[PDB]
């Protein structure tokens, strides 16, 4: 579905 | 009795207009309609609410449900309602207070007549469809609307300024549409009751309008994924009930509002992937903070000690900035830290000893800093760890014994430090280990046999250490092993002969050791091997002809004691550098064998 309204999940 | 009859007939008529492959409406086929699945009645036995959420119903919007004279709430959330919305569909729905059409298959435009046909609505959702064309300007005529969610459609044009007239709105969700590049309309600042503004992925340009400072009841402001410019305005700091600010992936510049520290209610703040400069505000009293993400900016200065006042902090991602100084020594002692990623900064001093103090830490990612000293023995007991990346620092001493065998640890990356010691046999515990990355250290001793018991291993990368003794025969039945790199060590003995276990082995790199014996023939039967470097060893005997099966990006057998002829496939002079320094070897060209 649509991305939630929440923090970016990006990480190393 | 009369109302039960009316209700039952209208519900059945509506159901006849739908396909029900899941048999969700089997109860609508003895019992009063007030007890049918999804149906709620008032005290006079009139249907007031129909909620068919997640029922897998297929077909056009069931207009007939609006003929129920007391129907106030209708939800068709998460079905396969399809076709388009017509003006007519809603002609009779004027008693509705709540209408949820989210997560269906609707296409075409929103009818311009919708507000006129649905003038009593407080709640409208049509999120997650394929709606196209513009949001009608007539939407400014809604007199009672409290929440509007059109997120996740293909709506285009720009956000209509007339939505600023709907001053009863408390939630405005328009995220993830196909609007033309435009500014946030100034008129949205008239929506002084707003608690939620979600305009992520709306092709927004320019600054956050100053009028939005009138939205003093904001709880969640989410403007992610746009090209908004200028400062993050300091008025966000004075929002007395703000819980979430999401501004990541924009073009915000300047500094974080200096008084951010007093936002006691704030739970989540993400301004990652912008062009922010200056420092992280200090005197933080961020009592409710759970997540702080500021990665990929140009922030400088330290992580303030006052971050440790955030006793519910679980996520801290500050990577790719210009942050400096020692980390607060107490970081994590008093917080349920779960994900910590401070990579690509200029932090120095020791890793805070209680970063996993509360036993919740999953990601410890600190690549490319100047952390020094030893890893605390505490981390050796941090059993929640899955992903550890400590590479390219100034760390030293021995790794804690338990660190090698942590039960959920998937990635263990320590490369390019000055760690010493032998890998213990308790590595046998690392049941979930996928990638061991420990190159460029001072590890000594033999590679322990137990590494061969970890069936999930895909990578063993240990180049540039002081490993000695033999390659354990056990490595040869790691069925998933993709990359084996033990170059630049002091390894001795031979390569095992039976290698059909290595069905996924893509890289075999053992260059610069003291390895002896023959190159096994089965090296050439490895189905996905593309990199083979056995150079600078003492391999003897002939180069197996099976190597001609492989398509090798890298083939290097130089500086060995090999003899016989080069296999014919590599006879051309462009491959010569693959075989230099084998006095016993020659190439067959035109009859004679040439050095
Ligand atoms: C940071 O945020 C920006 C937004 O400010 C974001 O840029 C967007 O990226 C997406 C995904 O990469 C882009 O979407 C693409 O658009 C092009 C056409 O312009 C096409 O390649 C694709 O469109 C398809 O759309 C349909 C799918 O529903 C297909 O059926 C159709 O055939 C097309 O192929 C693709 O979706 C988007 O264009 C930009 N948006 C803007 C406003 O620039 C960026 O990715 C983010 N950056 C990071 C690093 O996260
Ligand atoms: C949309 O509805 C579908 C169908 O009811 C939901 O899928 C079910 O999800 C539950 C778990 O919540 C499982 O028990 C079922 O096996 C699923 N069924 C099918 C057919 O997939 C789905 O959860 C709903 N989606 C949303 C976003 O709410
Ligand atoms: C709603 O739009 C989406 C996204 O464009 C469609 O989903 C699929 O789109 C991809 C290409 O991006 C295709 O491979 C599929 O054929 C599409 N799904 C299908 C045909 O089921 C989706 O089709 C659209 N839905 C409707 C009802 O038109
Ligand atoms: C094959 O491997 C040898 C080393 O085993 C390579 O030779 C080294 O190359 C580097 C250049 O980056 C030099 O610093 C070393 O001094 C060289 N070592 C020796 C012993 O000469 C060689 O370059 C590799 N050949 C190919 C074609 O990849
Ligand atoms: C609605 O869906 C059904 C089944 O997928 C299909 O047969 C029907 O024609 C659809 N209607 C429209 C307008 O797409
Ligand atoms: C609605 O909004 C438009 C656009 O900002 C404005 O010009 C107009 O006066 C407003 N009308 C009503 C009836 O609220
Ligand atoms: C934070 O400080 C500024 C003054 O520096 C003030 O305007 C704002 O109202 C304060 N916020 C809270 C939540 O107390
Ligand atoms: Mg401080
Ligand atoms: Mg490595």
Numbering used by the authors:
A (entry chain B): 58 to 69
B (entry chain A): 18 to 46, 50 to 615
Q: What does the literature reporting this entry say, word for word?
A:
The LRR-RKs HAESA (greek: to adhere to) and HAESA-LIKE 2 (HSL2) redundantly control floral abscission. A receptor protein called HAESA is found on the surface of the cells that surround a future break point on the plant. When its time to shed an organ, a hormone called IDA instructs HAESA to trigger the shedding process. The peptide hormone IDA binds to the HAESA LRR ectodomain.
A Hyp-modified dodecamer comprising the highly conserved PIP motif in IDA interacts with HAESA with 1:1 stoichiometry (N) and with a dissociation constant (Kd) of ~20 μM. We next determined crystal structures of the apo HAESA ectodomain and of a HAESA-IDA complex, at 1.74 and 1.86 Å resolution, respectively. IDA binds in a completely extended conformation along the inner surface of the HAESA ectodomain, covering LRRs 2–14. The central Hyp64IDA is buried in a specific pocket formed by HAESA LRRs 8–10, with its hydroxyl group establishing hydrogen bonds with the strictly conserved Glu266HAESA and with a water molecule, which in turn is coordinated by the main chain oxygens of Phe289HAESA and Ser311HAESA. The restricted size of the Hyp pocket suggests that IDA does not require arabinosylation of Hyp64IDA for activity in vivo, a modification that has been reported for Hyp residues in plant CLE peptide hormones. The C-terminal Arg-His-Asn motif in IDA maps to a cavity formed by HAESA LRRs 11–14. The COO- group of Asn69IDA is in direct contact with Arg407HAESA and Arg409HAESA and HAESA cannot bind a C-terminally extended IDA-SFVN peptide. This suggests that the conserved Asn69IDA may constitute the very C-terminus of the mature IDA peptide in planta and that active IDA is generated by proteolytic processing from a longer pre-protein. A N-terminal Pro-rich motif in IDA makes contacts with LRRs 2–6 of the receptor. The central Hyp residue in IDA is found buried in the HAESA peptide binding surface and thus this post-translational modification may regulate IDA bioactivity.
